[PDB]
Ligand binder design. Structure first.
Ligand SMILES: Cn1nccc1C(=O)Nc1ccc(F)cc1F
Length: 113
């Protein structure tokens, strides 16, 4: 029960803040299926920040859970696919921690609407 425009503005800002935490840009675009040919054997639903931006602008995220679910997919897919001793796995841990904090403050802003 709120106005759509300010909510989408908030999600845009939040997505930018999450992208800033991914300093290696490992989650900016889909995992290249040509470069990782076995990726879909293990990962049911790929996700990345560019796809999230497209979903946001297609009005596919109408509540904070919609948005956070796709962020969580970025993280969980990376933890699932990559071995624990890799930069990629640790980058997902870091994003979960740092991006979680961004998400908690942003959800609080949405609740004020
Ligand atoms: C499996 N994975 N999770 C996050 C990033 C990747 C990944 O394999 N990225 C990657 C690896 C080699 C490349 F040439 C390009 C990539 F985007």
């Amino acid at each position: 029960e709120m106005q759509l425009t300010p909510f989408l503005i908030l999600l845009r800002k939040t997505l930018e803040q999450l992208q800033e935490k991914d300093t290696g840009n490992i989650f900016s675009e889909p995992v290249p299926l040509s470069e990782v040919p076995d990726y879909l054997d293990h990962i049911k639903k790929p996700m990345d920040f560019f796809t999230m931006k497209q979903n946001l602008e297609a009005y596919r995220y109408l509540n904070f859970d919609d948005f956070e679910e796709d962020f969580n997919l970025i993280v969980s897919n990376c933890l699932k696919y990559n071995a624990k001793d890799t930069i990629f796995y640790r980058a997902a841990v870091r994003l979960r921690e740092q991006g979680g904090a961004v998400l908690r403050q942003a959800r609080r802003q949405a609740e004020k609407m």
